[PDB]
């Protein structure tokens, strides 16, 4: 009788486990990079801007006010890494230019 | 249910006695000090007791009774340390098996792992399946990382055979101990999943025949200059023939000249004194089977090798299948050539010892390994 | 599974006489056919030093067991130095009592025959030359598995084998040319050319064919009871001085 | 499977698409670029 | 002789090396040597070095520059203060190779575009400007010697003009990057001048 | 043999000044396929071989290091080299680079020279990555440290903090500080490799 009770409760638990796994995904795991889930779980102990850049372009897009705020923050971070790459290339160009100027003055 | 170091298993005491009797006294002193510093049981007051015991010149039996009857198995971490020190001491007992680490298209991936964060990740991946305990140390001489993975079962906890996975420091080739049970596939697959963390890695095995020691497999397939030459090209893996361009030119092989012997190219071997010519013949055999100049054993002892020579005469594929055996194959082959049984003028490169411990076929004069 | 041990015979003897003494000592009856066979019946032999007299001393008993079944294949020639020899199989006691009778009656000298390397090569050459009834020699092929067992320092190289498949053997034979000796003119020069391992000087142990025969250094294991004419011809040629 | 079908659909709609002068001479192509790039350090 | 032939012809073509003298003190050794990079026969530039071996426990102590042909001297002024002469020799050789390839590419483009429309070079040889109808196309090819990788890396960028003003730079940079990525260098530039023609397609 | 001795000495010192470049192509012959043509008794080579001698020159010890060798053998039916027996350690991937150069097939000599130059750039990058950390140790700005075989992952000590670095090709990508000012100090030292030498005096003054 206890075995049949457990079998009936496992059959009831199967539909519950399928329903609570088929809820709204809420941007679930196995979809972000390493650094996003490491910042989720806290204390990453190793920051690296290149992996943050390569993983922030991998996150998808989507109480709709917090959804609009998330998409606005996503556009903001996209503009951040865009300006970062632009500034890095321009800084390399400026450094080459002033290296030529320093060579001429010396 | 990931077991910590303070848990003690249920094993027989006499087999731990037999294992701990295979160690010297100073490593036993270091083990007692480290275990009492980490766990203790029955500060510096009990240290001078063993300091006075090792000064009197006691045997190993009274000190192994001391260590087995001030802790009375000890724990899982103490057993891991005992077995790993036994691995360091006698390396000829184990048997390694290499496996490459591919990713993406097929380009090899260097592991570049760190010993801190890898261990908890491997343990939290393995604990969702079985009871497990991992332990990872650094080899004191060779620059590798040996990881001892131990598993358990419930009929309290019956132990399993400990599974070893040896990581070299900067190579895409990962050695593991030879097993084929489902626990071996589980541990290797779990390591292949947890070492990646950015993009997925798979472990295609590069060899099927096991090799004996860790120095031998490190010299064969680790990060080393001997990793590909290994045979008659052993001179290029040590560079004993040339000096730097900033060296003298008076002591140069172009200026001094090396004593050589005129080879024979007609079939003058099947028709069969001067000890300088005998010394030059032994030097020729030493050149062909080894580098420049015991006395028969090679750099690495190879256990088993199976060749296959698929030539092609008048559009007929003529295969033969050489197979070898024994302790050191190419050393015994150099010995058989040294007794003038094998004509060294017609010994090809693949038989001579190059691409050692690789049993593969030959299709028109260029070696290739087997999967 | 009929392991053919080999023994030598000192003096040339006839076998039609004295066999009744073996019958009286044995209380059995044996048949001794007199086959005046001749090797390579093709006419390029000169009909001189090519014929032999074979005495297949069978034991026509109940054949329920093969280990007690023992033939005695003989050979002889009245032109060579050592004229005769025999070869026996089985694990019967009748082998011991008949070697006792052969030592006692005719007064001959018996000794076991040890094999060379070129002798084993010629036996592997001759154990595949099949004789048909149409007076020609058709040659079958077998995926031969050679063997070696040398002794080195610290047992470095214990044992190593050279295995050649059947189609490769037939290809080497057809690429060498038409000859009646493949295993001494084609394969062994091919192994010497592509490996440098001269198999005449390396220590042979077991030239094994593809389940057909198994030539050793002390015996010959076969699958059928009978032994061919060229095999015993090569063996009798080998023990000369 | 969705990426395979999407790749096939993209190839079929690009076959209808118009690229006559600057693309259709190759649509020896990317290998000479990598050769000259690792040669000239581009 | 065969080893010097493999060292001279097969692995360093058009390079004139000649040892000059050597001397020893009591245990060091001096060596003066010159190189003449003769890939550009119209104006080959040379250099002269002077090295000081330790000659046993092999170490370089002193090395310096005797004289440079005044053609790359300002460009070499930044590189010859790094005190690593292997980078100096390899950078000079790679600079000669890259400059010869650049002038070959530009000679090919001018020999293929001198028929239909006009053309002229620029500052030294670093950029090339063609014109049509008006519409102008400027292609840039800058060789940057390293300073503060170490090989001299090159840069390729193009720029257009519709007569009125310059075009946008982002789309032209993306188009020339994709066209060089897809076709090549000797073929990509022909395609980009054919698409800046745009008479038919 | 005195004038010929001086000529051979000039030849040897010319070989030395060419070998100071770093990438040289020394000739070689595999001693198994020295087949005789049997037309006059002379010996022709069946399969050609060309050996590359990579040689990186250090700056700290001011001497040449152990030279790494690459050997190429021509295939028997394609007239293209395939990488026979190289001596480079396996963290620098050699076979994939040889497959990547010129689409897999290498015909001319400068096509091999491009592959040799790529492997040379990789080796010199590893050597400079080791040298800069070794001279940072010798200048006693850092305490005892450990290096990898390729000097891509190191861990040194400063006066209070244990610092781990994972560096890519001549520029630092991932750092680690372990013992809200820690994150600023973490992102500050990121960048080039001589910038690390400059920025270490910016926080240890």
From Swiss-Prot, chain A:
What role is this protein assigned?
A: Component of the kinetochore, a multiprotein complex that assembles on centromeric DNA and attaches chromosomes to spindle microtubules, mediating chromosome segregation and sister chromatid segregation during meiosis and mitosis. Component of the inner kinetochore constitutive centromere-associated network (CCAN), which serves as a structural platform for outer kinetochore assembly.
- Stated name of the protein: Inner kinetochore subunit NKP1
Can you state the subunit structure given in the record?
A: Component of the inner kinetochore constitutive centromere-associated network (CCAN) (also known as central kinetochore CTF19 complex in yeast), which is composed of at least AME1, CHL4, CNN1, CTF3, CTF19, IML3, MCM16, MCM21, MCM22, MHF1, MHF2, MIF2, NKP1, NKP2, OKP1 and WIP1. NKP1 interacts directly with OKP1 and AME1.
- Organism equals Saccharomyces cerevisiae (strain ATCC 204508 / S288c)
- Superkingdom is Eukaryota
What residues of the intact protein does this structure contain? Answer: 62 to 179 of 238
Q: Which family does it belong to?
A: Belongs to the NKP1 family.
Subcellular location, record wording:
Nucleus; Chromosome, Centromere, Kinetochore
Swiss-Prot record, chain B:
What's an example Gene Ontology biological process for this entry?
chromosome segregation
Q: What is the lineage of its organism?
A: Eukaryota, Fungi, Dikarya, Ascomycota, Saccharomycotina
| Stated family | Belongs to the CENP-N/CHL4 family.
Task: Give the chief site where it resides.
Answer: nucleus
Which keywords belong to this entry? Cell cycle, Cell division, Centromere, Chromosome, Kinetochore, Meiosis, Mitosis, Nucleus
Listed name of the protein: Inner kinetochore subunit CHL4
**What does the record note on quaternary structure?**
Forms a heterodimer with IML3. CHL4-IML3 is part of a larger constitutive centromere-associated network (CCAN) (also known as central kinetochore CTF19 complex in yeast), which is composed of at least AME1, CHL4, CNN1, CTF3, CTF19, IML3, MCM16, MCM21, MCM22, MHF1, MHF2, MIF2, NKP1, NKP2, OKP1 and WIP1. Interacts with CTF3 and CTF19.
The UniProt record's further free-text remark is: Present with 606 molecules/cell in log phase SD medium.
Curated annotation (Swiss-Prot), chain C:
Q: What does this protein do?
A: Component of the kinetochore, a multiprotein complex that assembles on centromeric DNA and attaches chromosomes to spindle microtubules, mediating chromosome segregation and sister chromatid segregation during meiosis and mitosis. Component of the inner kinetochore constitutive centromere-associated network (CCAN), which serves as a structural platform for outer kinetochore assembly.
Q: What is this protein called?
A: Inner kinetochore subunit IML3
Anything else of interest in the record? Present with 125 molecules/cell in log phase SD medium.
Where does the UniProt annotation locate this protein? Nucleus; Chromosome, Centromere, Kinetochore
* Sequence similarity: Belongs to the CENP-L/IML3 family.
- Say where the protein is mainly found: nucleus
List keywords of the entry alphabetically: Cell cycle, Cell division, Centromere, Chromosome, Kinetochore, Meiosis, Mitosis, Nucleus
A cellular component annotation (GO) from this entry: nucleus
Organism of provenance: Saccharomyces cerevisiae (strain ATCC 204508 / S288c)
Cite the record's note on assembly: Forms a heterodimer with IML3. CHL4-IML3 is part of a larger constitutive centromere-associated network (CCAN) (also known as central kinetochore CTF19 complex in yeast), which is composed of at least AME1, CHL4, CNN1, CTF3, CTF19, IML3, MCM16, MCM21, MCM22, MHF1, MHF2, MIF2, NKP1, NKP2, OKP1 and WIP1. Interacts with CHL4 and CTF19.
An example of a Gene Ontology BP annotation on this entry? establishment of meiotic sister chromatid cohesion
Swiss-Prot record, chain E:
Q: Which domain of life is it from?
A: Eukaryota
Query: What is one process in the GO biological process aspect for this record?
Result: attachment of spindle microtubules to kinetochore
Keywords, A to Z?
Cell cycle, Cell division, Centromere, Chromosome, Coiled coil, Kinetochore, Meiosis, Mitosis, Nucleus
Q: Which GO terms describe its cellular component?
A: COMA complex; kinetochore; nucleus
What is the predominant subcellular site recorded for this chain?
nucleus
Q: Where in the cell is it found?
A: Nucleus; Chromosome, Centromere, Kinetochore
Quaternary structure annotation from Swiss-Prot or TrEMBL: Component of the heterotetrameric kinetochore subcomplex COMA, which consists of AME1, CTF19, MCM21 and OKP1. The COMA subcomplex is part of a larger constitutive centromere-associated network (CCAN) (also known as central kinetochore CTF19 complex in yeast), which is composed of at least AME1, CHL4, CNN1, CTF3, CTF19, IML3, MCM16, MCM21, MCM22, MHF1, MHF2, MIF2, NKP1, NKP2, OKP1 and WIP1. COMA binds the centromeric nucleosome-binding protein MIF2, and to the outer kinetochore MIND subcomplex. CTF19 interacts with the CTF3 complex subunits CTF3, MCM16 and MCM22 as well as CHL4 and IML3.
Question: Which family is annotated?
Answer: Belongs to the CENP-P/CTF19 family.
What extra comment accompanies this record?
Present with 1254 molecules/cell in log phase SD medium.
- Its protein name is Inner kinetochore subunit CTF19
The range of the complete sequence contained here reads: 151 to 366 of 369
């Amino acid at each position: 009788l206890s075995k049949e009770i457990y079998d009936n409760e496992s059959e009831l638990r199967a539909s519950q486990s399928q329903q609570i796994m088929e809820l709204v995904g809420d941007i679930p795991k196995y979809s972000l990079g390493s650094e996003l889930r490491n910042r989720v779980e806290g204390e990453p102990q190793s920051t690296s801007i290149e992996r943050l850049i390569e993983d922030v372009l991998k996150l998808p897009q989507m109480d709709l006010k917090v959804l609009s705020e998330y998409s606005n923050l996503r556009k903001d971070l996209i503009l951040k890494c865009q300006a970062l790459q632009i500034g890095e290339s321009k800084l390399s160009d400026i450094l080459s230019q002033t290296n030529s100027i320093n060579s001429l003055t010396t | 249910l990931r077991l910590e170091d303070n848990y003690v298993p249920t094993s027989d005491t006499l087999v731990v006695f037999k294992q701990l009797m295979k160690l010297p006294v100073t490593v036993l002193y270091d083990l007692t000090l480290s275990w009492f510093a980490k766990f203790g049981g029955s500060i510096y007051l009990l240290t001078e007791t063993l300091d006075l015991l090792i000064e009197k010149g006691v045997r190993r039996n009274v000190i192994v009774n001391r260590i087995l009857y001030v802790y009375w198995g000890l724990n899982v971490f103490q057993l891991a340390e005992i077995d790993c020190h036994l691995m360091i001491s006698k390396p000829e007992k184990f048997k390694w098996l290499p496996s490459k680490a591919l990713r993406g298209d097929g380009k090899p991936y260097v592991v570049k792992l760190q010993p801190a964060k890898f261990i908890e990740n491997l343990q939290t991946d393995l604990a969702k399946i079985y009871h497990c305990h991992v332990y990872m140390f650094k080899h004191p001489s060779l620059p590798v990382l040996i990881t001892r993975i131990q598993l358990f079962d419930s009929n309290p906890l019956i132990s399993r055979r400990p599974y070893y996975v040896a990581f070299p420091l900067n190579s895409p080739i990962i050695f593991h101990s030879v097993d084929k049970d489902i626990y071996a596939r589980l541990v290797l697959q779990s390591i292949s999943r947890t070492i990646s963390e950015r993009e997925t890695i798979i472990f295609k095995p590069v060899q099927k025949i096991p090799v004996k020691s860790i120095h031998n497999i490190m010299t064969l397939l680790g990060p080393s200059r001997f990793a590909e030459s290994m045979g008659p090209w052993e001179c290029y893996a040590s560079a004993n023939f040339e000096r730097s361009p900033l060296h003298d030119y008076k002591k140069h092989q172009g200026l001094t000249g090396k004593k050589v012997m005129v080879r024979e190219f007609d079939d003058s071997f099947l028709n069969d004194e001067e000890p300088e010519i005998r010394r030059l013949r032994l030097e020729k055999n030493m050149i062909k089977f080894k580098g420049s100049a015991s006395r028969y054993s090679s750099l690495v002892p190879i256990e088993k090798v199976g060749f296959t020579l698929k030539n092609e005469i008048n559009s007929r594929i003529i295969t033969i299948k050489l197979k070898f055996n024994g302790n050191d194959i190419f050393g015994g082959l150099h010995e058989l050539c040294d007794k003038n049984l094998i004509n060294i003028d017609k010994v090809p490169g693949w038989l001579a010892g190059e691409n050692g411990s690789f049993s593969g076929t030959i299709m028109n004069g260029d070696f290739q390994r087997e999967q | 599974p009929y392991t053919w041990k080999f023994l030598g015979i000192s003096k040339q003897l006839s076998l039609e006489n004295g066999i009744a003494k073996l019958n009286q000592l044995l209380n059995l009856e044996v048949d001794l056919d007199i086959q005046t066979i001749r090797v390579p019946s093709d006419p390029d032999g000169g009909t001189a030093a090519d014929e032999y007299i074979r005495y297949e001393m069978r034991l026509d008993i109940s054949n329920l067991d093969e280990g007690t079944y023992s033939k005695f294949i003989f050979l002889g020639n009245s032109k060579m130095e050592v004229p005769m020899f025999l070869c026996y199989c089985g694990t019967d006691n009748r082998n011991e009592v008949v070697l006792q009778w052969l030592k006692a009656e005719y007064g001959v000298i018996m000794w076991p025959i040890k094999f060379e390397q070129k002798t084993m090569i010629k036996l592997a050459d001759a154990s595949i030359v099949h004789v048909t009834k149409e007076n020609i020699e058709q040659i079958t092929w077998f995926s031969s598995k050679l063997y070696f067992e040398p002794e080195t320092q610290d047992k470095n190289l214990r044992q190593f084998s050279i295995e050649i498949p059947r189609e490769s053997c037939e290809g080497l034979a057809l690429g060498y040319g038409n000859t009646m000796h493949p295993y001494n003119d084609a394969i062994v020069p091919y192994i010497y050319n592509e490996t440098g391992m001269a198999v005449e000087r390396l220590p042979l142990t077991s030239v094994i064919l593809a389940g057909h025969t198994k030539i050793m250094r002390e015996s010959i294991v076969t699958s059928t009871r009978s032994l061919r004419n060229r095999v015993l011809a090569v063996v009798l040629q080998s023990i000369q001085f | 499977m969705n990426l395979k079908t999407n790749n096939k659909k993209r190839l079929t709609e690009k076959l209808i698409q118009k690229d006559l002068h600057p693309v259709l001479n190759k649509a020896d192509g990317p290998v000479t670029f990598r050769n000259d790039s690792h040669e000239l350090n581009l | 002789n065969l080893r010097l032939s493999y060292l001279r012809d097969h692995t360093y073509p058009h390079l004139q090396v000649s040892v000059q003298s050597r001397d020893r003190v009591h245990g060091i050794e001096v060596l003066v040597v010159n190189y003449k990079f003769c890939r550009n026969t119209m104006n080959p530039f040379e250099i002269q070095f002077k090295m000081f071996y330790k000659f046993e426990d092999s170490t370089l102590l002193k090395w310096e520059i005797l004289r440079i042909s005044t053609n790359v001297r300002l460009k070499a002024k930044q590189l010859l203060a790094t005190r690593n002469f292997q980078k100096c020799l390899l950078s000079l050789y790679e600079f000669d190779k890259i400059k010869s390839k650049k002038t070959g590419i530009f000679q090919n483009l001018i020999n293929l575009l001198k028929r239909k429309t006009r053309c002229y070079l620029m500052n030294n040889s670093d950029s090339l400007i063609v014109e049509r109808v008006t519409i102008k196309l400027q292609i840039n090819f800058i060789i940057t010697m390293p300073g503060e990788c170490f090989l001299p890396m090159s840069k390729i960028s193009i720029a257009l003009w519709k007569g009125g003003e310059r075009f946008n730079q982002i789309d032209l940079d993306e188009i020339c990057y994709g066209l060089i990525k897809e076709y090549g260098v000797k073929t990509g530039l022909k395609e980009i001048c054919n698409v800046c023609l745009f008479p038919d397609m | 043999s005195t004038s010929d001795r001086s000529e051979l000495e000039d030849y040897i010192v010319l070989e030395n000044v060419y070998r100071m470049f770093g990438i040289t192509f020394f000739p070689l012959v595999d001693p198994i396929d020295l087949k005789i043509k049997d037309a006059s008794g002379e010996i022709f080579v069946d399969r050609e071989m060309l050996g590359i001698r990579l040689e990186v020159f250090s700056e700290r010890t001011s001497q040449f290091e152990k030279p790494h060798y690459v050997l190429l053998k021509k295939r028997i039916k394609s007239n293209s080299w395939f990488l026979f027996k190289h001596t480079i350690p396996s963290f620098i991937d050699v076979q994939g680079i040889f497959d990547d150069t010129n689409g897999g097939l290498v015909i001319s000599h400068d096509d091999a020279y491009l592959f040799a130059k790529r492997v040379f750039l990789q080796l010199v990058e590893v050597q400079k990555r080791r040298q800069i950390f070794k001279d940072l140790e010798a200048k006693k700005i850092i305490h005892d440290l450990d290096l990898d075989l390729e000097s891509s992952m190191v861990s040194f000590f400063v006066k209070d903090i244990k610092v781990e670095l994972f560096v890519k090709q001549n520029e630092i990508v991932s750092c680690s500080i372990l013992d809200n000012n820690k994150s600023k100090w973490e992102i500050a030292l990121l960048g080039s490799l001589d910038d690390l030498e400059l920025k270490l005096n910016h926080s240890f003054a």
